Amino acid sequence: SPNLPPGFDFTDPAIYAERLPVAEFAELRSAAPIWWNGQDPGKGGGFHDGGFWAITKLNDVKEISRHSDVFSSYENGVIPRFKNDIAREDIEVQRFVMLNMDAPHHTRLRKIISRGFTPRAVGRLHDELQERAQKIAAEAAAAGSGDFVEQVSCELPLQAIAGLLGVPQEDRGKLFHWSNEMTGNEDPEYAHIDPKASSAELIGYAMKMAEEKAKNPADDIVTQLIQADIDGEKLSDDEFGFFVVMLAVAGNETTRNSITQGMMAFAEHPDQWELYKKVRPETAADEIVRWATPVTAFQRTALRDYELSGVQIKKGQRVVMFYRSANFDEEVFQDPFTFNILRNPNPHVGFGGTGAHYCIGANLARMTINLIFNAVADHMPDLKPISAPERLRSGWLNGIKHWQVDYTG
Numbered sequence: 001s002p003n004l005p006p007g008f009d010f011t012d013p014a015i016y017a018e019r020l021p022v023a024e025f026a027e028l029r030s031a032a033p034i035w036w037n038g039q040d041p042g043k044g045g046g047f048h049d050g051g052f053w054a055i056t057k058l059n060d061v062k063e064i065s066r067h068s069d070v071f072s073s074y075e076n077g078v079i080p081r082f083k084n085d086i087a088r089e090d091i092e093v094q095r096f097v098m099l100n101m102d103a104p105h106h107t108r109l110r111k112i113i114s115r116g117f118t119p120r121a122v123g124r125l126h127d128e129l130q131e132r133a134q135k136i137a138a139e140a141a142a143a144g145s146g147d148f149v150e151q152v153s154c155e156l157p158l159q160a161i162a163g164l165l166g167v168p169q170e171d172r173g174k175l176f177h178w179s180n181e182m183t184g185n186e187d188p189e190y191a192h193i194d195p196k197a198s199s200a201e202l203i204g205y206a207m208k209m210a211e212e213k214a215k216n217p218a219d220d221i222v223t224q225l226i227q228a229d230i231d232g233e234k235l236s237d238d239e240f241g242f243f244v245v246m247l248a249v250a251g252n253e254t255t256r257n258s259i260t261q262g263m264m265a266f267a268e269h270p271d272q273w274e275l276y277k278k279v280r281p282e283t284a285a286d287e288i289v290r291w292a293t294p295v296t297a298f299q300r301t302a303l304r305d306y307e308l309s310g311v312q313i314k315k316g317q318r319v320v321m322f323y324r325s326a327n328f329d330e331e332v333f334q335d336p337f338t339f340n341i342l343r344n345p346n347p348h349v350g351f352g353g354t355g356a357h358y359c360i361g362a363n364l365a366r367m368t369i370n371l372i373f374n375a376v377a378d379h380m381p382d383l384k385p386i387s388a389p390e391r392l393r394s395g396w397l398n399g400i401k402h403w404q405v406d407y408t409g
């Protein structure tokens, strides 16, 4: 038995509203790397199966991720915590995004979606996102101080999605609003926000975009997705709507929280910040993602009995891959608790473990991170925090809602 308080639940949103449970994860890696996380009736975050297996070692996370034939994303979705009284149908509706599908449905969709994340398509966004990163930093600097999350972290990830999809500038304001309103629904600051209605408006806008491109096909990603190839595979209008919802959801808070927590790490380690401003190493992005681990945990469901590192996982049981624990696995990383922007190799699982569902936007995220921190170094090299950050109440997402900083220093 690990040295934990009785009834500790690693998906408890009340934990992450206050802290990352780093020491509790380290105790599991030390005394029980695969530990049954029991859950009382009605306190399962929408799941009523009694609990889950906490997966805390990077090797075990990687094994689950590559064995998608056994560990299903579709059965219960990949998000391990919602509001306790969520209806089952609201969990299953997530199966319309490819993140919560299994093969062969997932395989078909990913093949089509791959057209949109080719090195070409992502690389073609570099110039506009650099210009936007410089403009964001310059505006924050001119403001002198403010909420780093809103003034520096929030916009560039949304502009990457907008620039990727070819969204007209006049529409990006409401698009960003809908994308942000699907967020942090478990936090009291956003308790009055309806993520269902926001998704419907995203789907409506996306489907109209697909209808415009059906009559006006140009050379852009959206056309390539809604244009049938030789084998006739393509995104239907509604599937494109679900793809945009996925991007607006997947490519938003995660990159944002990487930027905020990366700057928090720089503030806590000024020697690393001084090093970054001089050298600007591209390895910084991956260490920032390891340190930030924006997705604390995703889950899978065992479709058959499976033995994982001497532990018998039974059919139907959930496994929760705690990336936050794996990214600080003492047996994998040299000095895991050291923030080292020059860390290489850096085999973190912040983008998930290698497998069918590995983050398709990983290189877009790295580019966004590298560009915004170059802009921060260019325009506010002496920025200093004003007060402590406010964390997001979530059982699986690692979010910073607000962080007051002084750009002038």
Ligand code: HEM
Pocket (backbone or CB within 6 Å): 065, 078, 098, 099, 100, 110, 161, 246, 247, 250, 251, 252, 254, 255, 258, 289, 293, 294, 295, 298, 350, 351, 352, 353, 355, 356, 357, 358, 359, 360, 361, 362, 364, 365
């Ligand atoms: C630092 C930023 C990001 C982090 C930490 C992150 C993390 C993740 C994780 C953990 C997964 C699941 C891996 C698995 O289940 O094995 C994933 C998948 C995915 N990500 Fe990201 N992500 C980030 C940025 C982005 C961006 C910028 C985009 C798109 C613009 C994106 C789009 C997706 C999609 C579509 C999937 C589903 C892939 C599939 O199911 O086949 N992500 N991401």
Ligand SMILES: NC(=O)c1cc2cc(-c3ccncc3)ccc2n1CCN1CCNCC1
Pocket (backbone or CB within 6 Å): 079, 094, 099, 182, 183, 184, 185, 195, 196, 249, 250, 251, 253, 254, 295, 359, 397
């Ligand atoms: N801020 C949220 O809550 C939320 C954030 C988020 C991020 C991803 C993701 C990130 C990176 N790579 C792949 C996926 C997936 C789901 C995410 N979500 C769930 C929100 N979603 C709202 C409506 N109800 C169901 C849950």
Ligand SMILES: [Cl-]
Pocket (backbone or CB within 6 Å): 063
């Ligand atoms: Cl194996």
Ligand SMILES: [Cl-]
Pocket (backbone or CB within 6 Å): 180, 181, 183
């Ligand atoms: Cl928001």
Ligand SMILES: [Cl-]
Pocket (backbone or CB within 6 Å): 062, 347, 348, 349, 352, 353, 354
């Ligand atoms: Cl990996």
